[PDB]
Amino acid sequence: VVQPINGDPFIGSLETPVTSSPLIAWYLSNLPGYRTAVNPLLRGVEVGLAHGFFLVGPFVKAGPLRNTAYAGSAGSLAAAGLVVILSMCLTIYGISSFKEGEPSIAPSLTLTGRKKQPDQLQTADGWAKFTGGFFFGGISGVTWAYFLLYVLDLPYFVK
Amino acid sequence: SHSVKIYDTCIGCTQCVRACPTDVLEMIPWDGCKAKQIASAPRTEDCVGCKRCESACPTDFLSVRVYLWHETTRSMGLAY
Amino acid sequence: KYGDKSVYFDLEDLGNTTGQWDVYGSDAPSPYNPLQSKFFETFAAPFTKRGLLLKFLILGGGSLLTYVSANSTGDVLPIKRGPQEPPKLGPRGKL
Amino acid sequence: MRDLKTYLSVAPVLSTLWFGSLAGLLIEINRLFPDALTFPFFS
Amino acid sequence: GFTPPQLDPNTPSPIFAGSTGGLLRKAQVEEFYVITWNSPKEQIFEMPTGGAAIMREGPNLLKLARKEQCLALGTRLRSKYKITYQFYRVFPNGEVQYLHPKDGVYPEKANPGREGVGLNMRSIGKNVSPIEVKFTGKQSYDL
Amino acid sequence: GPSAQVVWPIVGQEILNGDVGGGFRGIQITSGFFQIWRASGITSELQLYCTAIGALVFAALMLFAGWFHYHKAAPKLAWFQDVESMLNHHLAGLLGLGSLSWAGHQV
Amino acid sequence: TFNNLPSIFVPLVGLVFPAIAMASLFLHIQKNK
Amino acid sequence: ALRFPRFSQGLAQDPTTRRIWFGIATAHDFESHDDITEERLYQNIFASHFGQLAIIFLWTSGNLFHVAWQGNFETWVQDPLHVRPIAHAIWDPHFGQPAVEAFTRGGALGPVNIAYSGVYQWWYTIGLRTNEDLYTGALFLLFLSALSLIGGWLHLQPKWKPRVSWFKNAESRLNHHLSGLFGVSSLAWTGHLVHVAIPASRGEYVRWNNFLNVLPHPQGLGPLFTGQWNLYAQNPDSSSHLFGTSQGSGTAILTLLGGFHPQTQSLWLTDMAHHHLAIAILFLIAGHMYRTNFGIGHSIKDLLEAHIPPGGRLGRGHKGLYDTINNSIHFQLGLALASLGVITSLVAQHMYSLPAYAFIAQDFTTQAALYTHHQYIAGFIMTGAFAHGAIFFIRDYNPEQNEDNVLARMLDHKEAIISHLSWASLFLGFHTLGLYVHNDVMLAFGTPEKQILIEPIFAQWIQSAHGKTSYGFDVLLSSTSGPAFNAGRSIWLPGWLNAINENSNSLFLTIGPGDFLVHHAIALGLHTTTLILVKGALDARGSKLMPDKKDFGYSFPCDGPGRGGTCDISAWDAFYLAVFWMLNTIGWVTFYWHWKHITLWQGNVSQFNESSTYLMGWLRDYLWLNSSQLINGYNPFGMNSLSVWAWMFLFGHLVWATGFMFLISWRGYWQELIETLAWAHERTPLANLIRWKDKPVALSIVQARLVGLAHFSVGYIFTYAAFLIASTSGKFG
Ligand code: CLA
Ligand code: CLA
Ligand code: CLA
Ligand code: CLA
Ligand code: CLA
Ligand SMILES: CC1=C(/C=C/C(C)=C/C=C/C(C)=C/C=C/C=C(C)/C=C/C=C(C)/C=C/C2=C(C)CCCC2(C)C)C(C)(C)CCC1
Numbered sequence A: 001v002v003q004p005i006n007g008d009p010f011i012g013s014l015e016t017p018v019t020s021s022p023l024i025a026w027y028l029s030n031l032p033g034y035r036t037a038v039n040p041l042l043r044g045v046e047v048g049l050a051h052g053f054f055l056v057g058p059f060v061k062a063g064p065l066r067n068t069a070y071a072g073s074a075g076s077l078a079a080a081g082l083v084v085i086l087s088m089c090l091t092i093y094g095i096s097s098f099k100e101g102e103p104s105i106a107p108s109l110t111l112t113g114r115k116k117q118p119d120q121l122q123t124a125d126g127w128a129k130f131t132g133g134f135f136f137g138g139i140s141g142v143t144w145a146y147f148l149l150y151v152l153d154l155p156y157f158v159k
Numbered sequence B: 001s002h003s004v005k006i007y008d009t010c011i012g013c014t015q016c017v018r019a020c021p022t023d024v025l026e027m028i029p030w031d032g033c034k035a036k037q038i039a040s041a042p043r044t045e046d047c048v049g050c051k052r053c054e055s056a057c058p059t060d061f062l063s064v065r066v067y068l069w070h071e072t073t074r075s076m077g078l079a080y
Numbered sequence C: 001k002y003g004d005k006s007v008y009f010d011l012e013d014l015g016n017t018t019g020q021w022d023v024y025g026s027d028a029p030s031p032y033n034p035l036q037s038k039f040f041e042t043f044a045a046p047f048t049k050r051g052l053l054l055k056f057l058i059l060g061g062g063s064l065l066t067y068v069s070a071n072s073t074g075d076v077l078p079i080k081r082g083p084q085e086p087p088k089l090g091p092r093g094k095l
Numbered sequence D: 001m002r003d004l005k006t007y008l009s010v011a012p013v014l015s016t017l018w019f020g021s022l023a024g025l026l027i028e029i030n031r032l033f034p035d036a037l038t039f040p041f042f043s
Numbered sequence E: 001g002f003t004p005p006q007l008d009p010n011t012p013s014p015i016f017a018g019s020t021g022g023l024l025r026k027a028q029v030e031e032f033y034v035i036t037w038n039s040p041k042e043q044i045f046e047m048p049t050g051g052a053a054i055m056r057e058g059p060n061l062l063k064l065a066r067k068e069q070c071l072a073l074g075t076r077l078r079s080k081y082k083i084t085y086q087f088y089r090v091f092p093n094g095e096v097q098y099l100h101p102k103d104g105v106y107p108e109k110a111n112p113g114r115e116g117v118g119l120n121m122r123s124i125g126k127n128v129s130p131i132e133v134k135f136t137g138k139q140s141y142d143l
Numbered sequence F: 001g002p003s004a005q006v007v008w009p010i011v012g013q014e015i016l017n018g019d020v021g022g023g024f025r026g027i028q029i030t031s032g033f034f035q036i037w038r039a040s041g042i043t044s045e046l047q048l049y050c051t052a053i054g055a056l057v058f059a060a061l062m063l064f065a066g067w068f069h070y071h072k073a074a075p076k077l078a079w080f081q082d083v084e085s086m087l088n089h090h091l092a093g094l095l096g097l098g099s100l101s102w103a104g105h106q107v
Numbered sequence G: 001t002f003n004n005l006p007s008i009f010v011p012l013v014g015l016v017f018p019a020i021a022m023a024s025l026f027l028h029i030q031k032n033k
Numbered sequence H: 001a002l003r004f005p006r007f008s009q010g011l012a013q014d015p016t017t018r019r020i021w022f023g024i025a026t027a028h029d030f031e032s033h034d035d036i037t038e039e040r041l042y043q044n045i046f047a048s049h050f051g052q053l054a055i056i057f058l059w060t061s062g063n064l065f066h067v068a069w070q071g072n073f074e075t076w077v078q079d080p081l082h083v084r085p086i087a088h089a090i091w092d093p094h095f096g097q098p099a100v101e102a103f104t105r106g107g108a109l110g111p112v113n114i115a116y117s118g119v120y121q122w123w124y125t126i127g128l129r130t131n132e133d134l135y136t137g138a139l140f141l142l143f144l145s146a147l148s149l150i151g152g153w154l155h156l157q158p159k160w161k162p163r164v165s166w167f168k169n170a171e172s173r174l175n176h177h178l179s180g181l182f183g184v185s186s187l188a189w190t191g192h193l194v195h196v197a198i199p200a201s202r203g204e205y206v207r208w209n210n211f212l213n214v215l216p217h218p219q220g221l222g223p224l225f226t227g228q229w230n231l232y233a234q235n236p237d238s239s240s241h242l243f244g245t246s247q248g249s250g251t252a253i254l255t256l257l258g259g260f261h262p263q264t265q266s267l268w269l270t271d272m273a274h275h276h277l278a279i280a281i282l283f284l285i286a287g288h289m290y291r292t293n294f295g296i297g298h299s300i301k302d303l304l305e306a307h308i309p310p311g312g313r314l315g316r317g318h319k320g321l322y323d324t325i326n327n328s329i330h331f332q333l334g335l336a337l338a339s340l341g342v343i344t345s346l347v348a349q350h351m352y353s354l355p356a357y358a359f360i361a362q363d364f365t366t367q368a369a370l371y372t373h374h375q376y377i378a379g380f381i382m383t384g385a386f387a388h389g390a391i392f393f394i395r396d397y398n399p400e401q402n403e404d405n406v407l408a409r410m411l412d413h414k415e416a417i418i419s420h421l422s423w424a425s426l427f428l429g430f431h432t433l434g435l436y437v438h439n440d441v442m443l444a445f446g447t448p449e450k451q452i453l454i455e456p457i458f459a460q461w462i463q464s465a466h467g468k469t470s471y472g473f474d475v476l477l478s479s480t481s482g483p484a485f486n487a488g489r490s491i492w493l494p495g496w497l498n499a500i501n502e503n504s505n506s507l508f509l510t511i512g513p514g515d516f517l518v519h520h521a522i523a524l525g526l527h528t529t530t531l532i533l534v535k536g537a538l539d540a541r542g543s544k545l546m547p548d549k550k551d552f553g554y555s556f557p558c559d560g561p562g563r564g565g566t567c568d569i570s571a572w573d574a575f576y577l578a579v580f581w582m583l584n585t586i587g588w589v590t591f592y593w594h595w596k597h598i599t600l601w602q603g604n605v606s607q608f609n610e611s612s613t614y615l616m617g618w619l620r621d622y623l624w625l626n627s628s629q630l631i632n633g634y635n636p637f638g639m640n641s642l643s644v645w646a647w648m649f650l651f652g653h654l655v656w657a658t659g660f661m662f663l664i665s666w667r668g669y670w671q672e673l674i675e676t677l678a679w680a681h682e683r684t685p686l687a688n689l690i691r692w693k694d695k696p697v698a699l700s701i702v703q704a705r706l707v708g709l710a711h712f713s714v715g716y717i718f719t720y721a722a723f724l725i726a727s728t729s730g731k732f733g
């Protein structure tokens, strides 16, 4: 089912099973990157929580102090630092890409041709709310990963 | 963008513009040669700078001449 | 018209022509619980001013970095532990 | 043949002939007169 | 005021199974250079975005990426298939600028009705040195 | 040391003819022709000279073949385009019979 | 404290001054008037 | 100008990312900035020079501050021969405890870096015997940096804004710079050496609290005003002097005894004092030459219009040259970089041989680091001198205002110059490579007696013309009966002879056939770099392939594939390929230096004199052998102090290879690759939300050339620095 995007052959993409399928499109459409209708703050919270855990993963066990007793604590600290930096670069991104009050640069159309509402994430205040959610969610996910490594160390692998 | 210029040594052979892939050039009438035509460059905004025009100018050095200048999205030849 | 037989240049609907599509941008409503959403709103609205967020991030991160590197001892980084070893005399005496 | 000699006179064929003759010359000189650093005649 | 633009209508497009060399976000915020041509038969041609397309019998329409794509296509059309072509420029606001002949005639036949610009009435060595135009916007070649 | 090349003493390059072994001064080759020849059961130098002469013969034959198949009687395009027969022959006739004949030598 | 000043200034300089500098310079790049 | 480049609205009107690179790279090309004048040009240059002085004083203050704070200078003063210098401490939190243990040198309680800059020796030779001295110096240089900054700020304000008629005052400026900036400056340096450095060498510390009381000489200024200057050369530290104590010291302040101090193997401080004094007299006299507001002096314009030879050999002479130099800042810059590069190479060639700092000859890594430094700096400065002459010939050269003059008659026979430089380089490369290869073969054939070994009779003649009796020419200084030896028989020649004949020091080394061959390699390098640069400069205005090259500027990629092809046709690309040949030449120079010196220091001069005549000796006995202790800086079992130099060695290898990417690969493969990348990013979900603001493009051809050369040269420099420092520090001979 490799017919082009929206059946439009002169747009540079295709509706292959990987892009446009009932399972993978649904998955890419019901996650906080593409929830264009809900406010960007909850989206950013979800995103930051997930990436905070994903970053605390390869800092405790993989790192300069992984074998020491300071593995979990200092690794979570480095993960929170990387999260602060990611919110930092997200912030300069929101400042540089769109200024203060312009309308959303997101597409106001869908595959079915409906003149949907534009994604307010791409606005200034919207991206700022998204960055705030990302920072809050990321620090929270870092400390929760630290908590789970603390109180529930035995089921997880140490190696 | 780029500044294409046609000097008065042109013989009006229409190779500069038949080689130009971006419609930058066009032949106009003139009274300076046996062919009674000379090339002009109105659409320099569409000039990428490929110098196919001056790789086909059969003169002492050149008559058409491309000067590299402020590069925009269309002079840089970007589809994005 | 964009929906005609192999017509992709609806000059009025330039979004469908140029490819402006939310390819996966579902406009479905908030699937979160309202109470936790309000909780996150009230607890992350401080991070709403991107400029204040950036100033806070840079200054507090630099402060925490200096604090960690100044209060950390040599047990967590060998550079502050010091030599804890006699110095070797270099070639030709020491020169 | 005129054209065979025209080809033998071409630059690579004549170059390899000339440098084979020359190389044989210098080779036989460095075999008959090996290991030469100074010109001793009327030295 | 002798040749009017053509104002391309909603014509059909060639039969093509879709590629990746097509229209990216440049079209969504800048021009994208529609081309229109008129085929005698349903024949097959190489697309400038890579891949083979099947042009339709009658008028066709292709919105590819940029000027060089449509002009390369049109040159291949005119040389290989001996077919009249004309292409445009479609800004995202809506305007459609006509560009390829701009006189109904291709830019090789020196047809009167076009003003000569980019025209220095001198040999190419008689341009002044840069010091003669130092600290001036005119670089070397606009006097 | 397997050696199959000797240099000419002219300009001191005769140092290249070294103590490979075998009462012989030459260059220690790294081609593995000696290993093949022990695998081909040569056990001589006469067989190698005969092989060289036969190979020179086949070289002249192939040169005549190129001359014949361009200048004297050159195949036309229907002959090359018959890839079916070409594969049937190069599989069975070159690689099949070639490996069979080498198995005969090997046995 | 003099032995503790590199521990304050090197993490300060080589990480924050890149943060400040690269951020402010990316903002200066991506600007419009 | 709307976007980041405020100085070029052609790059601000560039939706791609080329604008960032070109706003970095043209930031300091003021005469190409948009909508500017000559006033603003010169004023921005003046403020920029203030900023450069501020940075220079700040960097010197940082050196002083770190040597005072984190160094061991007070310990180095006592036992300098056996206490290691310390540049600055290190706080690298990536360090492991073996590396914390290995980098603890010079009697420090923490990791440190050994000062291979010689600043210890030069500060110790000029006084400065405490950390507080260096602290005061660093604080004063910080004050000087702030002074330069406020000066360059206020000289940009409209009230204090010099006009172009003030910058062009090339006679008042010359008089002032000569007289003050050289003569008075060296005079003040003498007034330091006489009042501080010599007393600090003779014992007592003369500081600001007591420098008015301490007589530099027991008879103060009577000998100077009464003309009896010989009373300042009475007790010239008669050969038993310990630098830093009164044992075997004297009372003289100005001498011409020449030669070296026996303890330090360096030049006498009294010789330096008398030297700076004498050249101060010369510069203060020469700075009263050019005409100024007082009615007397010379006009350089008429000096040039008068130096037109009758006969028309030079043609119109130097007519119209004052106006084409004073108006042209690139000509001033080119002449300046010419002189600066020559004197930088002179600094190198005279600091290795005639070291003017205490205990810098006997330490062996600084004496190599400084030479290598200043010679690579000189090569770069020389390439820049020629590049700015090319930029002059394009931008600032008016052929009508200097018609048929020395400069115009110069551009006429550019083909003659280029052809004869080509001849010289072709001759040298052919022959000397042939000889190195002949010797490589003759060793490869076990016949080293068949090698082409040409004894450098001319350099050996000059050596014997200075007092070296290692050859037996006995001419003009080795002959006792020569009048040149008889004239300075009682002034300097005893010390100079027991210096030049002493085969431990490094002035006028005993040279052999390898020195001949590598000097001819050096000549090949100089003539070839010169060829490339001169050819670019003279074909900068145009040639037959591109006669209107002046209209395209100095830096442009090419002229297209037409006319056969025009890759690397610009004078910028001549500079480019000349930087390659310059790095090659200075590499030959410094390889020669380092091997000759490391063999001298080790003791086996025979190693160089036998192995330098065939290239496999350099590849084996210099690179492969002296890289033994370096690459073992960190083995699978432990590391040592040379770990940093091995890491830097490999880092420089890495960037030197990365430059080959931008040089070999050119723009088009990368543009297409970036087009694929842009497709993928704009059609990759969860990254479609992120869209660039500057449209990404592959690097422009001239840019990527520059970037390849930057990586190439950084790798050249860092690699050879690692190797030189580690080899001379792994052993110190
Ligand atoms: C350019 C650099 C260079 C130089 C100067 C030399 C020089 C030399 N090499 Mg080296 N060599 C070089 C590069 C160089 N080589 C390179 C690059 C290689 C690697 C390819 C070698 C490899 C090499 C080897 C392996 C050997 C040499 C040898 C020699 C010697 C040759 C003497 C000889 O046989 O000539 C004798 C003269 C001739 C061959 C010329 C004869 C010309 C004819 C007769 C015409 C003249 C007569 C004419 C009619 C006029 C007469 C007068 C009247 C009629 C008017 C000489 C010292 C050999 C040697 O002995 O080393 C010391 C040797 O063994 N070289
Ligand atoms: C520049 C080209 C070149 C050169 C100079 C060499 C040189 C060498 N090869 Mg190599 N070789 C090459 C290309 C080359 N080879 C290629 C492209 C192949 C792939 C087919 C091989 C496969 C190959 C093998 C398998 C062996 C060598 C051996 C040798 C050495 C002995 C030479 C010989 O003829 O012994 C006699 C040759 C043989 C014993 C090879 C047997 C025949 C092979 C297996 C298949 C028959 C070819 C077939 C008809 C055509 C391809 C069919 C198609 C379906 C792929 C010598 C070092 C031999 C060696 O190292 O001995 C110590 C060895 O065992 N080579
Ligand atoms: C992962 C590799 C790695 C990293 C990140 C570092 C990091 C560091 N090392 Mg190194 N080091 C390493 C491996 C590494 N080391 C290894 C393997 C060894 C061998 C065992 C050493 C040996 C070593 C020594 C011996 C020393 C260090 C020092 C330092 C510190 C330098 C201070 C600083 O902020 O520099 C700032 C960065 C620079 C000065 C680089 C200047 C060039 C940049 C690229 C151009 C700037 C562009 C422009 C002009 C400015 C615009 C802003 C810019 C931010 C974008 C720093 C913490 C020094 C130290 O501790 O002093 C504090 C020191 O003396 N290291
Ligand atoms: C006597 C009066 C006087 C003095 C002292 C100066 C001094 C200076 N002027 Mg000048 N100037 C003057 C009058 C004077 N000016 C007048 C009347 C005008 C009227 C037009 C100008 C116009 C002018 C311009 C337009 C500019 C200057 C600049 C400069 C500075 C040159 C850069 C520098 O420091 O390198 C000084 C270099 C040396 C002292 C020596 C260099 C070469 C020696 C021989 C090398 C060998 C010895 C070496 C130093 C030993 C080192 C060993 C160890 C200690 C490291 C310097 C501060 C430039 C500047 O920076 O702007 C502020 C500049 O752009 N001046
Ligand atoms: C080892 C690398 C190398 C070598 C050998 C050369 C060689 C040369 N370069 Mg340089 N160059 C190099 C790297 C190198 N370059 C690099 C990396 C760059 C940066 C792009 C440049 C940039 C550059 C420029 C910009 C210029 C040169 C010039 C020259 C020529 C200088 C004249 C001379 O000495 O020639 C003497 C001859 C040689 C060194 C050639 C050696 C080979 C022998 C003699 C040939 C005979 C061997 C054999 C018998 C031949 C048969 C071989 C085979 C077919 C069997 C010469 C051809 C200049 C020039 O052309 O001046 C005339 C010039 O303007 N080069
Ligand atoms: C391009 C150009 C430019 C640049 C150039 C250059 C860069 C050059 C360089 C040059 C150089 C770099 C040179 C050098 C030279 C040197 C010399 C010329 C030397 C001399 C010497 C002598 C004469 C000596 C003597 C003596 C002795 C022997 C020793 C003892 C003493 C006595 C003194 C006796 C310019 C801007 C100008 C202009 C334009 C063009």
Ligand code: SF4
Pocket: B006, B009, B010, B011, B012, B013, B014, B015, B016, B017, B038, B039, B053, B056, B057, B058, B059, B063, B064
């Ligand atoms: S190619 Fe040159 S000569 Fe020919 S028509 Fe064009 S401008 Fe004239």
